[PDB]
Design a binder for this molecule. Structure first.
Ligand SMILES: O=c1ccn([C@@H]2O[C@H](COP(=O)(O)OP(=O)(O)OP(=O)(O)O)[C@@H](O)[C@H]2O)c(=O)[nH]1
Ligand SMILES: [Mn+2]
Ligand SMILES: [Mn+2]
Length: 566
């Protein structure tokens, strides 16, 4: 079975597309080499299709079935709720793509009669029609990155596939509770999205330490969605089916599984049939959960086949990292060879062969890695970092062009503890906000795939709640880590780290002599920039009325929104 079949019609864009970074009178303050930044467009959709299109051979053995059951027994433990039309409407983001039936996200969240009437029929249809493939739209995703060291090396557009708005709301009523609860229940501490960065770190380390002689690695499959089979999707459904569900929920899931999740026809923006999918759809509510479960299921089985000792995994979508007891170098190399031979068999071959690692700071996953620093008292603190090239490039692009979702904000949140996050991002953006007094204007950013509405003035609280205070006092980052950041600044033409020490004192000052919420931002966010450092006390309101539901589950491509946590 082929992951895709193409009729020749083009993946077309729904609007015009900006691909280059125009000469900015403020972004150059950030990055000077504009020709290094680029956003993906329809033009490269075909290169993507070729990467994404191939036959799938899958062989399932005893360990796989053994693991399936263990997972199912756990899922058996869950009672999932049917979400009401209203609840699901609220979960829809304000700029979620509009329906082909004459209403948009706004209409849906406002509970328009037209919108709710269509949703109801889409739901009724889920109960009356058990087999007709549901229409999906295929588009090229616009994403900004830095040119490849191979000079002019570019990533082709990634393809996004999703059903009409109406179906999406139905998916929510039918599966939102499930997709928010089953992953943990089934994978325990192995489910990654349940952890804030601070927790993901605690869990990696306490695990690494828990080993007499630790050996670890990260695994990532070559274009995972395409590797997901119809079989894999039905197994996924067998897992969902073990929950106690309402009758209509149970049929909605069952119908959604055959009509949408296993495959369906592909339609472009001009309304033409581009082909057919027989693999995971990037834009359905189940794709995060589905991928984690499938990833976890295959990997657990692979461990037992490769006979790895005391394996402990952490899974996020298709992002896998396993920490086991080293059984000797030579030994370890053969185990990963086997592990991979098994993953490949289960229909999930690697992008790059996994390398056994013996230094936790050396294992990278989710595009991130753990690093060490020291706090106020110099007590070796641990945190999560990542190469800053893509983040800095995106910050650049978001500066020259108001985009709907502001990744820089998100990166500050998740990476607040980091060197680059504090010294460049925090500095750059707080002066831009200062200038236009956009401190109060809330922005949309996403975490683990769900879009969140956030007020910059609340970063101290948020940062404090998530990383602790050490996030405001880390000071002796690793050589390795500092070298990476500097090397990257050179690559992008971003002014060296010390140039930023300067900029911050200013911004901060212009933030202390501002009072209120703005002022606090000034005291806590740039304490690394002032000569005369003060002693930061736990923020009152922060570790208080600060909302949650933030690190419960992944919703990438799931059309999820929350306007909580100020
Ligand atoms: O919302 C989405 C979209 C995509 N995917 C799928 O999960 C994988 C996570 O993508 P990766 O970071 O693994 O990149 P890759 O090397 O596997 O594939 P290239 O993207 O760089 O082409 C993607 O490659 C995609 O196929 C999801 O799981 N969820
Ligand atoms: Mn992948
Ligand atoms: Mn990945």
């Amino acid at each position: 079975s082929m992951s895709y079949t193409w009729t020749g019609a083009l993946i077309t864009p729904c609007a015009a597309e900006e691909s280059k970074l125009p000469i900015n009178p403020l972004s150059n303050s950030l990055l000077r080499h504009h020709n290094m930044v680029y956003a993906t467009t329809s033009r490269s959709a075909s290169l993507r299709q070729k990467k994404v299109t191939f036959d799938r051979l899958q062989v399932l053995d005893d360990h796989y079935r053994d693991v399936l059951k263990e997972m199912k027994a756990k899922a058996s433990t869950v009672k999932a709720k049917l979400l009401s039309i209203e609840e699901a409407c609220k979960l829809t983001p304000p700029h979620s793509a509009k329906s082909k039936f004459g209403y948009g996200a706004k209409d849906v969240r406002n509970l328009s009669s037209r919108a709710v009437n269509h949703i109801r029929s889409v739901w009724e249809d889920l109960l009356e029609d058990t087999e007709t493939p549901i229409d999906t739209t295929i588009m090229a995703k616009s994403e900004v990155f830095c040119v490849q060291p191979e000079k002019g090396g570019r990533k082709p557009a990634r393809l996004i596939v999703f059903p009409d708005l109406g179906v999406r709301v139905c998916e929510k009523m039918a599966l939102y509770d499930v997709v928010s609860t089953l992953p943990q229940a089934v994978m325990g501490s192995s489910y990654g999205f349940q952890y804030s960065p601070k927790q993901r770190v605690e869990f990696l380390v306490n695990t690494w330490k828990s080993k007499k002689c630790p050996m670890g690695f990260s695994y990532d499959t070559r274009c995972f969605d395409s590797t997901v089979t119809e079989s894999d999707i039905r197994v996924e459904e067998s897992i969902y089916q073990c929950c106690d569900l309402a009758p209509e929920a149970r049929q909605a899931i069952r119908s959604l599984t055959e009509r949408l999740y296993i495959g369906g026809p592909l339609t472009n923006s001009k309304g033409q049939n581009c082909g057919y999918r027989r693999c995971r759809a990037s834009g359905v509510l189940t794709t995060s959960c589905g991928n984690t479960l499938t990833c976890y299921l295959k990997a657990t089985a692979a461990c037992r086949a490769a006979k790895l000792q005391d394996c402990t995994m952490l899974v996020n979508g298709d992002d896998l990292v396993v920490i086991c007891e080293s059984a000797g170098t030579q030994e370890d190399a053969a185990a990963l060879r086997a592990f991979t031979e098994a993953m490949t068999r289960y229909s999930a071959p690697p992008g790059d062969p996994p390398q056994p690692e013996y230094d936790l700071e050396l294992i990278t996953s989710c595009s991130s890695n753990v690093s060490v620093a020291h706090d106020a008292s110099g007590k070796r603190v641990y945190y999560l970092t990542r190469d800053p090239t893509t983040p800095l490039a995106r910050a650049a692009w978001e500066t020259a062009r108001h985009t709907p979702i502001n990744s820089w904000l998100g990166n500050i949140i998740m990476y607040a503890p980091t060197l680059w996050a504090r010294m460049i991002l925090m500095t750059h953006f707080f002066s831009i906000l200062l200038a236009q007094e956009q401190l109060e204007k809330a922005l949309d950013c996403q975490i683990y795939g769900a879009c969140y509405s956030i007020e910059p003035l609340d970063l101290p609280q948020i940062i404090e709640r998530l990383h602790g205070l050490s996030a405001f006092t880390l000071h002796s980052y690793s050589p390795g880590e500092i070298n990476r950041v500097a090397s990257c600044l050179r690559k992008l033409g971003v002014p060296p780290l010390r140039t930023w020490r300067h900029r911050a004192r200013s911004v901060r000052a212009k933030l202390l002599s501002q009072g209120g919420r703005a002022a606090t931002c000034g005291r806590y966010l740039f304490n690394w920039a002032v000569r005369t450092k003060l002693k930061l006390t736990p923020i009152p309101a922060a570790s208080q009325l600060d909302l949650s539901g933030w690190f419960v589950a992944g919703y990438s491509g799931g059309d999820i929104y929350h306007s909580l946590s100020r």
